[PDB]
Design a protein around this ligand. Structure first.
Ligand code: A1B9A
Lengths: 39, 156
């Protein structure tokens, strides 16, 4: 049986760690909500 | 139980110790998470119970106690913040600029950050702190890395 625990407020924090790239990917979504790359 | 607005961890005691299977957003008395996290099973918050209200396996979203309340969306221009809640680690905001998932039904946002599968359900925020979607459903790219979509529900 699953249970929930509070992990904090939801706020935007200025001066946060800025990382990660921005890629454009051609994808497909199946009936099961599972993504797949299209080529 | 506790129904204060905020971000929450979704845990399970079904395995060895307490394992984090995901994350979710409590907003306006409704707990929003990803369907693959809870599978539509009821959740517990202390002595209290949270029963499913809405869910969809294709969208991969589920709401508890009421209908989906999160209606904000990415503008397609600005940098967002993944409020990552990783297993055993403290909540941490990571500012990033999303990419794009181009599909046959329109384009969606996409955050390229590397976290364990148990981080699924963590909200993605706009500059106002509004939840523009959940992190945890996407694809594996050429280098084995995971790129998640920005998944938002519909508000009626
Ligand atoms: C690194 N990594 N490897 C796998 C994963 C997944 C994942 O398996 N998501 C998932 C699973 C089942 C289903 C759906 C999605 C939707 N249909 C059902 C999630 C994340 C999140 C942190 C980003 N990281 C992963």
């Amino acid at each position: 049986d699953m249970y929930i625990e509070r992990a904090g407020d939801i706020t935007w924090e200025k001066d946060a760690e800025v990382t990660g790239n921005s890629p454009r990917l051609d994808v497909a979504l199946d009936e099961s909500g599972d993504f797949s790359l299209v080529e | 139980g506790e129904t204060t607005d905020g971000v929450y961890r979704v845990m399970t005691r079904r395995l060895l110790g307490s394992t984090q299977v995901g994350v979710g957003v409590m907003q306006e008395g409704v707990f929003h998470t990803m369907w693959h996290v809870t599978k539509g099973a009821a959740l517990r918050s202390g002595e209290g119970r949270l029963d499913p209200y809405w869910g969809d396996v294709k969208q991969d979203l589920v709401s508890y106690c009421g209908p989906w309340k999160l209606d904000a969306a990415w503008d397609g221009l600005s940098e967002v913040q993944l409020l990552a809640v990783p297993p055993g680690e403290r909540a941490k905001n990571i500012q990033t600029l999303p990419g794009i998932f181009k599909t046959k039904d329109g384009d969606i946002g996409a955050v390229a950050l590397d976290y364990p599968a148990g981080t699924s359900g963590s909200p993605i925020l706009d500059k106002c702190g509004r939840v523009i979607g959940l992190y945890g459903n996407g694809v594996v790219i050429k280098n084995g890395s995971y790129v998640s979509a920005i998944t938002q529900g519909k508000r009626e």
